[PDB]
Amino acid sequence: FVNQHLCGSHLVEALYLVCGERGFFYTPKT
Amino acid sequence: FVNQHLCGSHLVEALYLVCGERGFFYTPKT
Amino acid sequence: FVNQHLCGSHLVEALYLVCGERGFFYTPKT
Amino acid sequence: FVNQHLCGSHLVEALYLVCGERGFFYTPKT
Amino acid sequence: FVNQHLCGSHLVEALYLVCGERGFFYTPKT
Amino acid sequence: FVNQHLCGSHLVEALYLVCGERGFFYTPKT
Amino acid sequence: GIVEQCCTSICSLYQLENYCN
Amino acid sequence: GIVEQCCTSICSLYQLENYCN
Amino acid sequence: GIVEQCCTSICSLYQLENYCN
Amino acid sequence: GIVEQCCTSICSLYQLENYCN
Amino acid sequence: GIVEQCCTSICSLYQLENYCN
Amino acid sequence: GIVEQCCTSICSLYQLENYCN
Ligand SMILES: [Zn+2]
Ligand SMILES: [Zn+2]
């Protein structure tokens, strides 16, 4: 695999693919 | 009006849109 | 809901979700 | 070659690609 | 058709739509 | 854990994520 | 869970907010 | 409408231009 | 317009709703 | 091909790397 | 190449078509 | 955090995996 530059919704898409049925948490800094 | 189905990556895109900075969890096994 | 920063096709995706079966018009400045 | 089906958010992504600055309307009830 | 400004995964989405069942090659500079 | 189905634009989004700079080919007729 | 509510069945954007942190 | 032409049936990118403004 | 505002500044889903048919 | 492996059937992200250049 | 041109400048769908198989 | 790192720098799929449930 390669490193990736992911902003906005693209990060969410990547988490979805990496985690699959495990699901994930999306937690940006506030 | 009536709602549509949101599945997979489309569902997490929708969670990103609705939650944004608040963050969210996508836990399909739940 | 939260405010969002939407450029390009991401705006189209957001309109799609917000409007659902109502549909929408996408009208950028020319 | 023969064409594929474009539905939902994929259909409006395709309208954004083909129309761009011209803008477009997505009216599924029509 | 109109000209488009496509970066990252958006370029991949555009190739997918333009090429359809023909498929395509994605080849960035290294 | 078990894997999900990746089709169409979702499949090439996944190829973009996994391959990135290396590039990839999407050849559905193969 | 969210899949049953929003994918298998349908849900509003208001219901989606149930899954925000 | 567009859904019947392009989602239920299939359409070309040229046909999609019918829905541009 | 809304396309430019959402990109150069921020916009709400309620502002977007005004573009629904 | 990739469609049969990953869309019709299922594949891991490791298997997807088979289609990288 | 095409990947860089589309991002740093603009590109047409006809230029993209040259990357189809 | 990971959201900021991936956008301002780069991140790996292995770093992302730490956010899976
Ligand atoms: Zn983007
Ligand atoms: Zn889809």
Swiss-Prot record, chains G, H, I, J, K, L:
It comes from the Eukaryota. Disulfide bonds join 6-11. Transmembrane segments: none annotated. This is Insulin A chain. It comes from Homo sapiens (Human). The gene is INS. The chain holds residues 90 to 110 of 110 of the full protein.
